[PDB]
Design a protein around this ligand. Sequence first.
Ligand SMILES: c1ccn(-c2oc(C3CC3)nc2-c2nnn[nH]2)c1
Ligand SMILES: [Zn+2]
Length: 195
Amino acid sequence: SVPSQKTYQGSYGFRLGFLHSGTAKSVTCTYSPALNKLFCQLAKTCPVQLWVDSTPPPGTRVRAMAIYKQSQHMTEVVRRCPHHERCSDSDGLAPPQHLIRVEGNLRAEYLDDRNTFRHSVVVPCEPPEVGSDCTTIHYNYMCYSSCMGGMNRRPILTIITLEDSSGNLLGRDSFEVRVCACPGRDRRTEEENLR
Ligand SMILES: c1ccn(-c2oc(C3CC3)nc2-c2nnn[nH]2)c1
Ligand SMILES: [Zn+2]
């Protein structure tokens, strides 16, 4: 009833990477290594690098899923709030209830788990382009952390899993996410609080 969040590089040396976007007031997505926390604006591009030490098999996939970070909320499905699930901002592929979308990939698949009712979005692994050492996926988060009747100010984690063609676990990594109006300011504030 609770997805694992244990970091696991596995046989292929799987791990995430994040850009260095800084903390200017205008920044739309920014990652804090000290907090292991991504700060982003609503529905804006969040680039996440997918690193491996060795090539996984054809048919390997990468899945993203959100869970609540606090243990007392972890069995609750993370979903869009009663406003945003109804605001008709469909991209033609993501169900309107899903918090996490993949941008610009027609092979993205959206799962409503028939047993756990959790949402996830999964894409096929592709080889890096010539000149690149990794591929990058672009996520969008479709509700604010503060949305009433939804996340309601509760922090979430995103869990990224590398899966074989059956859905078996090959690798796992994760990061906290705050979806907010001013990611640069909030990253600076939280890093200062940590210090
Ligand atoms: C996301 C995570 C791994 N991959 C990946 O998939 C593949 C072929 C199976 C398609 N090669 C890579 C690779 N990435 N960096 N180097 N090689 C995509
Ligand atoms: Zn919302």
